[PDB]
Amino acid sequence: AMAEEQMRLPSADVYRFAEPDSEENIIFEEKAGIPIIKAGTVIKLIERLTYHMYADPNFVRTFLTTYRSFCKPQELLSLIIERFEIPEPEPTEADRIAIENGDQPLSAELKRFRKEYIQPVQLRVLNVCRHWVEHHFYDFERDAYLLQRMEEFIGTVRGKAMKKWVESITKIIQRKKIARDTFQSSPPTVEWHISRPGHIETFDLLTLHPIEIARQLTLLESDLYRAVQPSELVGSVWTKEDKEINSPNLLKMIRHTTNLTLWFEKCIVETENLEERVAVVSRIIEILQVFQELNNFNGVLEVVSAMNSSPVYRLDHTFEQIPSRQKKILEEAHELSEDHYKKYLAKLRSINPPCVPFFGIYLTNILKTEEGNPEVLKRHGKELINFSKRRKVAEITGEIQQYQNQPYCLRVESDIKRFFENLNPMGNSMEKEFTDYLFNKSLEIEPRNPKPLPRFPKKYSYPLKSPGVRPSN
Numbered sequence: 001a002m003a004e005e006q007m008r009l010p011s012a013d014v015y016r017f018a019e020p021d022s023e024e025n026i027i028f029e030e031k032a033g034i035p036i037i038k039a040g041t042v043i044k045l046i047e048r049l050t051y052h053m054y055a056d057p058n059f060v061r062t063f064l065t066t067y068r069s070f071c072k073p074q075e076l077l078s079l080i081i082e083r084f085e086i087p088e089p090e091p092t093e094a095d096r097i098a099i100e101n102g103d104q105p106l107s108a109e110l111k112r113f114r115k116e117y118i119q120p121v122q123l124r125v126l127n128v129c130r131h132w133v134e135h136h137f138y139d140f141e142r143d144a145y146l147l148q149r150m151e152e153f154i155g156t157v158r159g160k161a162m163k164k165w166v167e168s169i170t171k172i173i174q175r176k177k178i179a180r181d182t183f184q185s186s187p188p189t190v191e192w193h194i195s196r197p198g199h200i201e202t203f204d205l206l207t208l209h210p211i212e213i214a215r216q217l218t219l220l221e222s223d224l225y226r227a228v229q230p231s232e233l234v235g236s237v238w239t240k241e242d243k244e245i246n247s248p249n250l251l252k253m254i255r256h257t258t259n260l261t262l263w264f265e266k267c268i269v270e271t272e273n274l275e276e277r278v279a280v281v282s283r284i285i286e287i288l289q290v291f292q293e294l295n296n297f298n299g300v301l302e303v304v305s306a307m308n309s310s311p312v313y314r315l316d317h318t319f320e321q322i323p324s325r326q327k328k329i330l331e332e333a334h335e336l337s338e339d340h341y342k343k344y345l346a347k348l349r350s351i352n353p354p355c356v357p358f359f360g361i362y363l364t365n366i367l368k369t370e371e372g373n374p375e376v377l378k379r380h381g382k383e384l385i386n387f388s389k390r391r392k393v394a395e396i397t398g399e400i401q402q403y404q405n406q407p408y409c410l411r412v413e414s415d416i417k418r419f420f421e422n423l424n425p426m427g428n429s430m431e432k433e434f435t436d437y438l439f440n441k442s443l444e445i446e447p448r449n450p451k452p453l454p455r456f457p458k459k460y461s462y463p464l465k466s467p468g469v470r471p472s473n
């Protein structure tokens with residue numbers, strides 16, 4: 001009987017998106033509301049992306065976030081244009097006869113197929129096009145040819161029934177192209193210490209104010225967190241060949257984290273004088289204290305990584321001189337990470353904006369999803385794209401997005417921003433050469449047990465006492 005349903009759809013030789021659903025081309029999870037697609041052929045994914053029966057804004061969103069893991073942007077545009085071009089059924093025998101007598105056909109089925117299948121599918125295709133240009137315009141910025149195809153397609157759609165949708169998409173494309181270029185309170189005063197405004201040559205860990213290091217690193221990290229698009233995290237594209245094109249905001253975030261962490265370690269192990277090194281560790285702990293004040297969890301866990309690093313953690317003689325109060329701040333910061341970040345998560349959900357979440361936990365959990373789930377599922381010999389796997393990755397990038405609209409009430413300082421944008425602790429060395437050298441400096445400044453502890457001369461010729469972390473008026 002339902003076979004009567006599929007004989008009212010075009011044949012497989014004139015149209016590819018009306019073959020019946022089977023266990024070997026589409027799978028769902030297990031209500032009587034919209035089903036959850038688990039796997040399918042890219043043809044079945046396109047069919048359901050643009051399904052006639054209902055709107056599906058969650059599949060549209062998830063599909064357009066994750067599709068580059070199984071389908072090129074050029075191929076996606078080709079498939080949805082093909083989906084759009086639906087052949088009309090032949091006239092019935094009686095209407096055939098009438099047509100060649102120059103008489104009006106009834107066209108009952110033809111009119112129904114247009115209203116109930118073609119029009120809605122076509123509206124679903126324009127809806128996909130709009131979401132695509134609104135939420136993923138970078139696809140069109142990276143590929144001027146893709147944008148040319150989209151505009152010709154949209155510009156040749158017929159009917160006043162779809163005029164509205166077309167004008168809307170064209171508006172969004174024009175707003176996006178045009179883009180080519182604050183506050184409710186006052187921010188607090190920019191804090192200075194030994195370095196004075198403009199005197200950039202004197203900028204260093206101990207010469208800048210620790211309050212203002214933490215503030216400027218929080219602003220720079222806020223912006224880097226906010227620039228990351230979910231698609232930069234799908235199908236591990238930041239760990240593969242085209243990384244710089246596909247994941248540029250993510251790589252900037254990872255490279256800042258690497259550079260700040262390694263710079264902290266470098267500042268520590270390259271201060272060979274024990275008394276001066278204690279001052280460096282203690283200043284980095286105060287920077288952490290201000291990160292916490294600002295709910296910059298990213299920065300907090302960057303300081304934790306530095307102190308937990310194989311070169312730093314072994315410095316028994318240094319941590320021996322750190323006052324109890326500073327050790328406790330560092331211990332409680334570490335404990336954020338224990339038991340799969342239980343206390344970090346409780347803390348994140350308990351605070352009020354603004355914040356910078358710890359980014360590393362999302363990368364860890366996307367990687368475990370990528371490595372622990374198969375790219376494709378097999379049914380009856382056929383390979384189906386594992387969509388549930390992409391959905392799981394997209395839900396984690398969903399968590400990232402929750403926190404990307406939280407600007408800080410803090411003045412920028414351009415020279416300090418520049419100073420931290422320009423961190424290059426590794427020099428022209430690669431990462432393993434640098435970490436090996438840091439460990440070997442550690443051994444030199446604090447040798448392993450049997451050998452006793454040499455003295456080393458002072459390198460800093462300015463006062464090492466900290467101005468503290470009260471902003472004071």
Ligand SMILES: Cc1nc(N[C@H](C)c2cccc(C(F)F)c2F)c2cn(N3CCOCC3)c(=O)c(-c3ccc(C#N)nc3)c2n1
Nearest residue numbers: 304307308309313319322326327328330331332333334335
């Ligand atoms: C309270 C605390 N703080 C740590 N680091 C902070 C930032 C820290 C680092 C450096 C100095 C201090 C100082 F203030 F003493 C710190 F608090 C910890 C670091 N690590 N490692 C993690 C991987 O890399 C090597 C070090 C640990 O295993 C544990 C640990 C050990 C045993 C148990 C049990 N049962 N639970 C946790 C830590 N526990």
